Ligand SMILES: O=C(O)CNC(=O)C(=O)O
Ligand SMILES: [Mg+2]
Ligand code: NI
């Protein structure tokens with residue numbers, strides 16, 4: 052069995068290997084990459100996402116989110132308070148202000164220590180989930196707006212034609228902006244490209260061990276767990292690496308830098324934080340290997356998770372027994 056310790060693997064495809072996206076994902080899985088839940092892909096030196104980032108300041112962040120924490124430094128939730136619209140140029144200036152800027156630090160490890168010590172005492176503002184793309188239309192390789200759609204994959208594998216669309220999303224971050232512990236909708240893959248700016252640190256639990264994280268989360272967030280049998284779908288709970296180690300939860304960590312891709316694999320729980328002002332693009336995708344994970348994915352039916360239009364068909368076709376309950380939670 053390849054990668055039996057479930058380490059995060061790093062790949063360096065050549066320009067020739069960068070042509071066929073599906074083939075390269077299958078190659079990484081042949082080497083055991085999916086066992087970690089997360090892989091890094093460094094693009095060949097010949098490749099670029101677009102020519103420059105000099106002209107992005109007029110993008111609008113319609114609903115910036117202030118991420119307010121509750122709990123203790125290593126075990127907390129966050130809620131999202133909506134703020135007034137601002138442009139990317141305005142948000143960049145805000146991220147660089149004395150109130151929000153990255154503190155002086157020695158290295159990534161010192162910054163990670165400072166994040167976990169101090170995160171709860173601040174409320175950073177995140178531009179999340181903005182439909183759009185920063186890939187040039189002429190970029191033919193690993194262009195996250197030109198991937199094969201999940202609806203087409205389901206149709207190819209299973210024969211059933213369904214409604215829905217699959218487009219990318221932009222994320223504008225600052226120091227301490229936080230992504231809570233989660234798997235993707237319907238335990239899909241994700242791919243994330245860091246277009247510009249400061250790094251993103253990731254934490255990940257191997258898919259084969261995801262239920263260990265879920266059982267800890269139920270212990271640590273006992274009111275939330277009574278409220279919903281899949282409350283990590285709410286995307287609000289944080290648990291630090293120190294607390295995971297104290298509780299014996301298998302996990303790994305890695306830092307993504309600008310110009311790098313990360314792939315999350317089906318049922319790979321992940322969480323993390325941004326180091327300073329940055330911009331990422333991400334989208335969900337599927338492969339044949341995903342179908343069995345989609346059929347078994349948990350679902351939130353309590354009302355909190357609320358998701359895209361396109362998840363309807365995935366539930367309806369893959370999980371018909373759960374469909375009526377889940378749809379009630381959507382309404
Ligand atoms: O970058 C972020 O805030 C969150 N991204 C992801 O969870 C992802 O790409 O799957
Ligand atoms: Mg612009
Ligand atoms: Ni994700």
Ligand SMILES: [Zn+2]
Nearest residue numbers: 279351353355
């Ligand atoms: Zn719920």
